[PDB]
Amino acid sequence: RLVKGYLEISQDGYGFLTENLHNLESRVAIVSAGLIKQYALRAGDYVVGQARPPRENERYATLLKVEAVNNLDPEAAKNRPRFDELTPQFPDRQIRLETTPDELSTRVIDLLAPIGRGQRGLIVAPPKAGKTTLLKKIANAVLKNEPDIKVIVLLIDERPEEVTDFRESVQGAEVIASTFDEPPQNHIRVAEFVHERAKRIVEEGGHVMILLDSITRLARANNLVTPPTGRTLSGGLDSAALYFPKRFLGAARNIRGGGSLTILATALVETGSRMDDVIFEEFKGTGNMELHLSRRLEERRIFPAIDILKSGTRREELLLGEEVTHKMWLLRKVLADMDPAEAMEMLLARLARTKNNKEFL
Amino acid sequence: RLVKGYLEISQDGYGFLTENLHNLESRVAIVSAGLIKQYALRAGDYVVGQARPPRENERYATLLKVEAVNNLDPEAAKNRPRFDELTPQFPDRQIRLETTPDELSTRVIDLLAPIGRGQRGLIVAPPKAGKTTLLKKIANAVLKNEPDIKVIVLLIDERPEEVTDFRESVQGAEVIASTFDEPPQNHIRVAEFVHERAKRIVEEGGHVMILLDSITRLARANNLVTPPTGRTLSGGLDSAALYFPKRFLGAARNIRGGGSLTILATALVETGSRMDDVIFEEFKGTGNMELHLSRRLEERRIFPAIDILKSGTRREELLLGEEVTHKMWLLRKVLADMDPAEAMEMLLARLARTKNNKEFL
Amino acid sequence: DQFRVGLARLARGVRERMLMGSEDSLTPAKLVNSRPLEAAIREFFSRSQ
Ligand SMILES: Nc1ncnc2c1ncn2[C@@H]1O[C@H](COP(=O)(O)OP(=O)(O)O)[C@@H](O)[C@H]1O
Ligand SMILES: Nc1ncnc2c1ncn2[C@@H]1O[C@H](COP(=O)(O)OP(=O)(O)O)[C@@H](O)[C@H]1O
Ligand code: BEF
Ligand code: BEF
Numbered sequence A, B: 001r002l003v004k005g006y007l008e009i010s011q012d013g014y015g016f017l018t019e020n021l022h023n024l025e026s027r028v029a030i031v032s033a034g035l036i037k038q039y040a041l042r043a044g045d046y047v048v049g050q051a052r053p054p055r056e057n058e059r060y061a062t063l064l065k066v067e068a069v070n071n072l073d074p075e076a077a078k079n080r081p082r083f084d085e086l087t088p089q090f091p092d093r094q095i096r097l098e099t100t101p102d103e104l105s106t107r108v109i110d111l112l113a114p115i116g117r118g119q120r121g122l123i124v125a126p127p128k129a130g131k132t133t134l135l136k137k138i139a140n141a142v143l144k145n146e147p148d149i150k151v152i153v154l155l156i157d158e159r160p161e162e163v164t165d166f167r168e169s170v171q172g173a174e175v176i177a178s179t180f181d182e183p184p185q186n187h188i189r190v191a192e193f194v195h196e197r198a199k200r201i202v203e204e205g206g207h208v209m210i211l212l213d214s215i216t217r218l219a220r221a222n223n224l225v226t227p228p229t230g231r232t233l234s235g236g237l238d239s240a241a242l243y244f245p246k247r248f249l250g251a252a253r254n255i256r257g258g259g260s261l262t263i264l265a266t267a268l269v270e271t272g273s274r275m276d277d278v279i280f281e282e283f284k285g286t287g288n289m290e291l292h293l294s295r296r297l298e299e300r301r302i303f304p305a306i307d308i309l310k311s312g313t314r315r316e317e318l319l320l321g322e323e324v325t326h327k328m329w330l331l332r333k334v335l336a337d338m339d340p341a342e343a344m345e346m347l348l349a350r351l352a353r354t355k356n357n358k359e360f361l
Numbered sequence C: 001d002q003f004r005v006g007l008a009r010l011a012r013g014v015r016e017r018m019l020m021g022s023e024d025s026l027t028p029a030k031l032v033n034s035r036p037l038e039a040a041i042r043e044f045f046s047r048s049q
């Protein structure tokens, strides 16, 4: 009998193998501390191996033998550089975005905020400004442009119907979700488990993206889980609560030893709460990509409702050739002077004609 | 067997020798209180000497003999003026700046804020204003203009890849860093250790420049570490947290008996937080040099994006001759009335022609 | 004799642990723990009247 799951090490030195729901489950498989010390396993490690039905007085099946860890043999798990010891650098290898049902949006992203592997990216928008739909487009474009990469879709504190839509529209990539019906604790647990799994995979030189809707809601859960910290930050935030979201987001990085973690998360702003704006500003100093969407641009029903001027990346020279870089510089010079809605409509009109390379020509 | 390190005296009367990482390790060398009293060693004192492997039940190596302290014989440690009693003066010894990859930057710095030995200076900029790049230029310029002076780079709460870039671009000078991935505890510890080392060296008549990126993040770590202090200052600051940053910064000074401690630090402003603005104003009352960077100039891609009018020092006469002082006075009078971006463009065009002294003619 | 008492108690714990010990890679620690008899010797030399 074979079982599979993701390793979750308990305080007692023994661990459990989890299912996709990322929670304690009756079918979780026991893993003794002995096996953990044997295979140098770590939280988030994907473990597959023969297991047996629990003996009398055993409530959970036990892993009889370890066969594969993160889809590979356990040996390499003993001798491998630790994720925290991997060198973090800039994303030096870009990804071109294209999704058939909306190529306008993917091309506009390509021209505004090119994506590389190891990206720490963020999209900032008021409610109802193309955020969730845009993230769907990016997921689809990745699953057409970067099939090799372990694409992970994480949905925190968000809408159940959106979970269903993305589950169905992600064509099989790992969609993990925890709706607003769930308490913050479930959100934090699932998010951290997914995070640890991603870091374990990237440890193996693997390429991962985490598409995190509502990183702000994750920060809210982090705040509410922070038990005192003493003083409260202005706007209702806690001083030490944001350390966990900050580390969470800053884990994404380019590795000079292979593989990387690219996290694209969604930020809410202009919500009338100092809390949201403070979270936005705090994460901006950690991220290498910001893409702004304007509420007014939505209100006119012109899409994708992107705020061109505010959007951009850092170190585009590392993801673009000089021709593309100077093209982008020319375009931004042309667009800097003129209004958001007008700018976006005009750009859509120009880009509707041809694919980006021809609109260049 | 020879060992080396920097002395960290613990609460128990015995100390440890550390490496550049500025924390506890397994390889730190034990130093008995007897040796400390014998050679008057203090925290930050650099100790080199023959050591021995630990005996059984001993966990760290012990310094069998002291050979050199602060690169000199231990006897002088007995008879030397203590750092805190060194007479402070104004910086009476200017340091000319020239860095080949951007001599316009160093030139404008010279024409806006001449640097001396014992300078207590600050560069104030919003996010993404070349603050970090300007600090890099200053470092590179010092590493040819003042190769003699012990150049220490302290990066606190900042981007790991910037740490790598400065490590490689500093050409071997002492780069100490503690990224935002670290808790404030690590930041404070490393900063204090580096500071104590610097004061110990300057006590030896030594010259030190500490280029500190993110002094405001250091203040943030101080505020987070401060256990209560009770009442909250406007902006979320703590009343007594800033005492330690203030002392840290005010330590920089001109010694009338030899050596100097100069600290050039990077400050954040226009961040939307009263906290940063209060920190800036509080430190401005202790420093002698301020160089202001404009976000709008960066948005126009005009570098160095300096706010000339807000830029300046105190007691420039001590760092400039009469001809230079009056030339700078003329230059400010002309540029006093001009708009920030356009004034910078004017100055850059005028300086692009030739070297500064040639620009005078 | 206090020594033997400690060894007997240690035999109890090591006995339970071996059966709980899934694999044979349990001799060093899963079979060995000096807390019981060590504290017993302390008890006899200090808590014995
Ligand atoms: N590119 C688009 N094309 C068509 N409809 C869009 C587009 N972007 C957003 N919308 C509309 O906006 C509504 C909510 O968008 P969503 O992105 O979920 O809001 P938010 O940006 O707050 O997540 C949807 O009902 C959808 O019809
Ligand atoms: N002199 C310069 N030359 C080229 N790029 C610059 C210069 N100054 C700033 N930049 C741009 O600004 C960014 C660095 O921001 P930085 O100055 O480190 O932030 P802060 O000013 O808050 O420390 C880089 O991405 C770079 O493109
Ligand atoms: F309500 Be929206 F999706 F932020
Ligand atoms: F974002 Be900058 F480096 F302060």
Ligand code: BEF
Pocket (backbone or CB within 6 Å): B284, B285, B286
């Ligand atoms: F900083 Be001054 F003394 F007002």
Ligand SMILES: [Mg+2]
Pocket (backbone or CB within 6 Å): A128, A131, A132, A133
């Ligand atoms: Mg939405």
Ligand SMILES: [Mg+2]
Pocket (backbone or CB within 6 Å): B128, B131, B132, B133
């Ligand atoms: Mg910076």
